[PDB]
Amino acid sequence: MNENLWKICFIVMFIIWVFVRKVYGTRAMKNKSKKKVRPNFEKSLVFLNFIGMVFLPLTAVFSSYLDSFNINLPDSIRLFALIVTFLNIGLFTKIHKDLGNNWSAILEIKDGHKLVKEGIYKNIRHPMYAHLWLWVITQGIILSNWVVLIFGIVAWAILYFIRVPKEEELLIEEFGDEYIEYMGKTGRLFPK
Numbered sequence: 646m647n648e649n650l651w652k653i654c655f656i657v658m659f660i661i662w663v664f665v666r667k668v669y670g671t672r673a674m675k676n677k678s679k680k681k682v683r684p685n686f687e688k689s690l691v692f693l694n695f696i697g698m699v700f701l702p703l704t705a706v707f708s709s710y711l712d713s714f715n716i717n718l719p720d721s722i723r724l725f726a727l728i729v730t731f732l733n734i735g736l737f738t739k740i741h742k743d744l745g746n747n748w749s750a751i752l753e754i755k756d757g758h759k760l761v762k763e764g765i766y767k768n769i770r771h772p773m774y775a776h777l778w779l780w781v782i783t784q785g786i787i788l789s790n791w792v793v794l795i796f797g798i799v800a801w802a803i804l805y806f807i808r809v810p811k812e813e814e815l816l817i818e819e820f821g822d823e824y825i826e827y828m829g830k831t832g833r834l835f836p837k
């Protein structure tokens with residue numbers, strides 16, 4: 646109930662959410678790049694979310710600035726998020742482990758890149774995104790603030806929406822038919 650509390654909660658899930666990536670990422674950044682794509686652009690699109698995921702909500706916690714925009718939400722609906730975010734971080738570490746040396750945020754195609762249909766990736770390509778999709782939906786409700794809610798959602802949806810079709814096109818360049826088959830056998834976010 647205490648508001649100062651939820652902040653302490655989130656800044657943890659976050660702190661750990663970040664830890665999960667900081668671990669798996671530096672591991673796959675030690676693998677050299679082959680072809681990148683419009684990276685000077687994606688970088689910004691990312692950094693755009695970087696506001697949405699981190700810079701922005703960090704300041705719904707460590708600062709009172711955004712206070713007037715928060716949603717005055719009942720504790721019931723907030724916990725519902727806190728649960729799901731938990732499940733998320735699992736899924737994250739699931740996904741993120743399933744991916745490993747292939748991951749980047751910029752559309753890299755890595756030197757030894759191997760296409761993975763096998764993991765949480767069977768029946769879902771871009772699970773990670775679907776994760777992120779949730780991530781932004783949840784953290785707004787958890788933090789119960791409209792800006793942190795509304796903004797974050799947008800900045801992703803965009804990056805998402807203009808991101809994915811190049812990504813798919815890109816993977817098709819490299820893997821050719823193996824990817825077209827894949828998409829037939831998979832959905833983008835939910836399965837089937």
Ligand SMILES: Nc1ncnc2c1ncn2[C@@H]1O[C@H](CSCC[C@H](N)C(=O)O)[C@@H](O)[C@H]1O
Binds near residue numbers: 740752759812
């Ligand atoms: N199905 C796949 N198998 C292996 N690498 C993939 C992949 N889909 C995307 N990638 C790589 O992953 C990087 C983006 S990370 C995003 C991965 C996936 N879209 C997800 O959200 O779960 C891109 O550089 C792309 O080269």
